Chain A
């Protein structure tokens, strides 16, 4: 109840500020004012053209790494069990393989951006 009410207020306040911004001020619209900016010279193309990604491999590696925090985040709760020896072995196993994943990518020049 209180969370939803707080979220509504926080975003509503922002929207009111934007509405004030677009309506209170005096406006004078003409084609050149509303033109794309490229330091005073008209753009020589479209911003919607392909923009090459030189860190594509690191980006994909992020998805795999970003999951294993979900596997590792429960560890504070897991350290609360009575079968600690099995845990500690498995917790360190999971972290150590993430290190092995990092090393293989690192040593195979996967962390270097393409030209």
Chain B
């Protein structure tokens, strides 16, 4: 670790987190689909979306885990995948000073089970996912828009939603109220093509098709 500019490696954590992944997969074969640990030492558990409550409850309550805090719950839109939405749970264990990421998937129409029974923090996070991505969480206390305007139609954070949207607001003196109209921009957003034609990272080269 004497290279000034290169991030040091911590193999002790990599061995520790890798073993715990084997521990979870052995205990929860019914739902675990993949376990991976990264170069910068973070463990990811990838599960079938029907094991959200079983897996989260086990991690929260098992004595060799105790992930009592839900740091974040979010989603990622990957259109090419037939299940375009990736649901990510990031959990913190104060007892063992460790973090684990849990990943599952869903599509536009398939619901996910709400994690509120496991973590009461998930109430608002799940509302945000619905508002921004359109994913429905079943058996939620109150699922409704949280970040978008009242009556806003669409799910902005999907990759197919235009950045500037479809409608814009202004005040009209005739009707003496704020009205919504289709969006016209005096200056169109300028799309810059920045990707270089030359590969940068060989280690991630995808196998030829």
Contacts and interface: CB of A to CB of B under 8 A. Distances in A.
Indicate yes or no for A touching B, C-beta below 8 A. Answer: yes
Interface in A11-30: 30
Nearest to A31: B176
Interface in B151-178: 176
Nearest to B177: A32
B150 to A, nearest CB: 10
Contacts of B176: 30-32
Contacts, number: 3
A75 B135 CA distance: 78
Main secondary structure of the interface of B (DSSP, over half): loop
Chain A: interface size category: under 10
Interface string B87-116: 000000000000000000000000000000
A30 B176 CA distance: 10
Interface string A49-93: 000000000000000000000000000000000000000000000
B172 to A, nearest CB: 13
A32 B176 CA distance: 8
Nearest to B176: A32
A5 B176 CA distance: 50
Nearest to A30: B176
A49 to B, nearest CB: 24
Contacts of A31: 176
A100 B52 CA distance: 64
A31 to B, nearest CB: 8
B166 to A, nearest CB: 25
B175 to A, nearest CB: 11
A74 B56 CA distance: 76
Nearest to A32: B176
A59 B91 CA distance: 53
Contacts of A32: 176
Contacts of A30: 176
B177 to A, nearest CB: 9
A72 B176 CA distance: 62
A31 B176 CA distance: 9
B178 to A, nearest CB: 11
Interface string B168-209: 000000001000000000000000000000000000000000
A83 B49 CA distance: 94
A17 to B, nearest CB: 33
A32 B171 CA distance: 13
B179 to A, nearest CB: 14
B114 to A, nearest CB: 28
3 contacts: A30-B176, A31-B176, A32-B176
Q: Which 3 A-B residue pairs are closest in the complex by CB-CB distance?
A: A32-B176, A30-B176, A31-B176
